[PDB]
A paper describes a structure:
A key component in the generation of cellular energy is the F1Fo ATP synthase, a biological rotary motor that converts proton motive force (pmf) to adenosine tri-phosphate (ATP) in both oxidative phosphorylation and photophosphorylation. The enzyme is based on two rotary motors, termed F1 and Fo, that are coupled together by two stalks: a central rotor stalk and a peripheral stator stalk. The central stalk is comprised of subunits ε and γ and rotates during the enzyme’s catalytic cycle.
Here we present cryo-EM data showing [name] F1Fo ATP synthase in different rotational and inhibited sub-states, observed following incubation with 10 mM [name]. Masked 3D classification focusing on the central rotor highlighted sub-states in which the εCTD adopted either a condensed down conformation or an extended half-up conformation. In this study we observed the εCTD in two conformations, a half-up and a down sub-state. In the half up sub-states, no density for εCTH2 was observed, however εCTH1 remained attached to subunit γ. When the State 2 εCTD half-up and down structures were compared additional clear differences beyond the εCTD up and down conformation were observed. When aligned on the stator a subunit, the Fo ring rotates the equivalent of two c subunits in a clockwise direction when viewed from the membrane (akin to the synthesis direction). The twisting of the central stalk involves the εNTD rotating about the γ subunit and this is mediated by a ~10° bending at the foot of the N-terminal γ subunit helix (defined by residues γ39-57). When the εCTD is half-up, εCTH1 provides an additional link between the εNTD and subunit γ, stabilizing the conformation of the central stalk together.
Numbering used by the authors:
A (entry chain a): 4 to 269
B (entry chain X), G (entry chain Y): 1 to 52
C (entry chain H): 3 to 103
D (entry chain I), E (entry chain Q), F (entry chain P), H (entry chain L), I (entry chain O), J (entry chain N): 3 to 79
Write the structure that this text describes.
């Protein structure tokens, strides 16, 4: 097996893009060129982790009792109180959407990041040898397409709430008039308030991808370069650090979604 | 990296996990919690009424 | 040089002209010298020590107080105790029961 | 060929300078928020509002600068 | 080749230095707003009205630099 | 030469300036947390959650240049 | 380079990570769940005092 | 005729360094006005007068570099 | 061919700048710990726990840059 | 020939910026030690202990930079 380390690090950074036209499992030696080549690995792992979220919480929500709770049911209501207490801090309106939106974003983006902890060759090896797929990488949030899909999803929510809760009359005042007030400044203000609105979600998704990509790539580099006897002394101090990043990047995507949807209407 | 059709696919999965979570997961859990919190208040009231 | 007072609501403790003091400030130990810019602090329990004119050495223990400085003047408004115990609220507790009994 | 290959160096300059400007500018502004939050802690949801007012002004210029850097790499080059 | 290349570089230095100026200059000014906000919170609607005047001058000069940066990329090419 | 070596020089400029901006901006902000946490040591859970609000905004804009810097080396060069 | 060697070094580095997680990350969690089942019990006992 | 290409670069560095100096100078100077307004708010139209007397001097040298750099870009180039 | 000398320069810029940001940001942050440890010396076990929480964030983006500078010199060059 | 010569310029920028990072960062951290020792002179053997705990983190990065600057200058040369 002619793995040079510069090539081993190469093949790991290739996702399972597949063309709708050919329906063919592409491989890293030659990348085809079209938009329509879904990254198979990301969709499958994203919905399997998303199903595991909903299957766990429903298996408790369908039974959860107001007695002394069981030791599993108590771990679910701790996350429910953490999510509701953070909503209740930063949102006062009546909307039934914000609380469950904030939950699914926290628990799903947490599960997506958690994949980066697993040994970098474990699932990719099994997929090539056992199955025969040309490639795999198993962290969904270490790819842009999922994180911009969530961040543009929240942007459509940001526009729905600012139209709904204050109307086109109010939304047209705030976009033109602020921050300089006088109608003399309107032409400049339309650039500043328009891009600042887009700056909020673009920072959400690219913060999450930027962390996750540059944490998966560190495990690919430490695996690719260092000899086996020596990997653990640079791998173990990094996995211990990235447990902190996987939580904080799930907590911040939750928090800023609430803050943006909350400060949109009120 | 590369922008891709995955951006639409993830947007279907995202909306549908929010809709089943909104109906099924969240209302039955928060009814069950608030039903406990309410009873604690009922116990406190009973202690006040007893003394009076 | 400057004119030091040490006083309490009960009494004058000292008055006289002073070449320097060492005095135990709220955030740390402090020395005051002639013409030192105006200054305000609480003072900790402990010694203030003084040299009078001709550098004669004098030590006073203080339960606490407030120090302040003005051009030509230092005054230490000392008090009898910390007062921060506030255990004398208990002394008001029998003021009630003895009225009810 | 050097025409496009230098443009990646043009966007690197533009959005790198924006990254030092915006992160230090919010770091100063955010520091006066947390010290305001420790002097008047019953007050945080007032001041945080104000922090989000003025942080909307701080980032607007760096975020067009980053956006125009991204445009040079993906569009032009 | 390298005439069109260098115009984009000339816009990168122009918008990069302007993004440092506009970001840092509001960081300092908006932190002094926040500390007058924390000291006298009922007075915020008055200082905010002074913050928007002063902040308009700070960006006024960086924003003719940004306007010439977009001119050099889009218009001269 | 000129294709590959400049793309590493572009990534060096992008992820070096983001190292300046995101480190110093969180040094400035993180010192006001530790000063507030020495003034009001019952507040630290309240101030650290405010610190996590503010630190998210500081790091976001450098993290644009960190992820795109890694794109230029690995995807482009 | 040897590929199976990379999997060997990843195993050693995972084992040492698990052993840190077990001694510094998990007990804070089983502390928290246990101390939120302590609180509930006290409140339920308080309700019995209200009942008395 | 290569001469045109550097003159856009020579105008770019005058207007970028002017935008740094004229934005951070008015940010330091205006931020001490706002603490002066938070202390003594019945004084504000007295302090605005001194702020505009002093802010004209911060902008003496930068409005000349914006002045001559905007010349070089159009008249000479 | 000559190309391999720019790869060391690219790592030098990337790794030195990350040593500016990782050293000063810990110095700012660490001195504010010492100032509060001087004040409340019975709280040295608590503040020293917070310092490691916030210090973990300061050096994060510097750690990526130092890791990519080692990759460039040894692995690529 | 430039494959010898640039490597001394590539090491000079590594051991310049490592020297600005380690000297300013210890000066800020060491000066806060010196005030706390002047205020709290009973505590010096305490603060000196925590100064040496905190000082070894400031130097972790600048000694990567200077050790690679020595390696680049002499080993690869």
């Amino acid at each position: 097996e002619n793995m040079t380390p510069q090539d081993y690090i190469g093949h790991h950074l290739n996702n399972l893009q597949l063309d709708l036209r050919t329906f063919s499992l592409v491989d890293p030696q030659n990348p085809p060129a079209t938009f329509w080549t879904i990254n198979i690995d990301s969709m499958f792992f994203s919905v399997v982790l998303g199903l595991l979220f909903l299957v766990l919480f429903r298996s408790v929500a369908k039974k959860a009792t107001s007695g002394v709770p069981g030791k599993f049911q108590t771990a679910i209501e701790l996350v429910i109180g953490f999510v509701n207490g953070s909503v209740k801090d930063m949102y006062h309106g009546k909307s039934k959407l914000i609380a469950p939106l904030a939950l699914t974003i926290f628990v799903w983006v947490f599960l997506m990041n958690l994949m980066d902890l697993l040994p970098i060759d474990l699932l990719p090896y099994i997929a090539e040898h056992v199955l025969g797929l040309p490639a795999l990488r198993v962290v969904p949030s270490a790819d842009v397409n999922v994180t911009l899909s969530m961040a543009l999803g929240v942007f459509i929510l940001i526009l729905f709430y600012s139209i709904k809760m204050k109307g086109i009359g109010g939304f047209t005042k705030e976009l033109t008039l602020q921050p300089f007030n006088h109608w003399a400044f309107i032409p400049v203000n339309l650039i500043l308030e328009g891009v600042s609105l887009l700056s909020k979600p673009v920072s959400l998704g690219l913060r999450l991808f930027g962390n996750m990509y540059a944490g998966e790539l560190i495990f690919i580099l430490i695996a690719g370069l260092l000899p086996w006897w020596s990997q653990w002394i640079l791998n173990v101090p990094w996995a211990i650090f990235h447990i902190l990043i996987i939580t904080l990047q799930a907590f911040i995507f939750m928090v800023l979604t609430i803050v943006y949807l909350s400060m949109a209407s009120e | 990296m590369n922008l891709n059709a995955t951006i639409l696919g993830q947007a279907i999965a995202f909306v549908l996990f929010v809709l089943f979570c909104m109906k099924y997961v969240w209302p039955p859990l928060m009814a069950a919690i608030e039903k406990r919190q309410k009873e604690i208040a009922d116990g406190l009231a009973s202690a006040e009424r007893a003394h009076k | 040089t400057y004119h030091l007072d040490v006083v309490s609501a009960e009494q004058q403790m000292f008055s006289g002209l002073v070449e320097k003091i060492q005095v135990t400030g709220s955030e740390g130990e402090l020395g005051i010298y002639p013409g030192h810019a105006p200054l305000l602090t609480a003072i900790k329990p402990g010694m203030i020590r003084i040299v009078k004119q001709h550098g004669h050495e004098e030590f006073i223990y203080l339960s606490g107080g407030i120090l302040e400085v003005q051009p030509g003047n230092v005054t230490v408004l000392a008090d009898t105790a910390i007062r921060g115990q506030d255990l004398d609220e208990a002394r008001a507790m029998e003021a009630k029961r003895k009225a009810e009994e | 060929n050097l025409n496009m290959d230098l443009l990646y160096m043009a966007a690197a300059v533009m959005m790198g300078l924006a990254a030092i400007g915006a992160a230090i500018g919010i770091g100063i502004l955010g520091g006066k928020f947390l010290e305001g939050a420790a002097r008047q802690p019953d007050l945080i949801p007032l001041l945080r509002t104000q922090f989000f007012i003025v942080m909307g002004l701080v980032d607007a210029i760096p975020m067009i600068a980053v956006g125009l850097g991204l445009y040079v790499m993906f569009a032009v080059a």
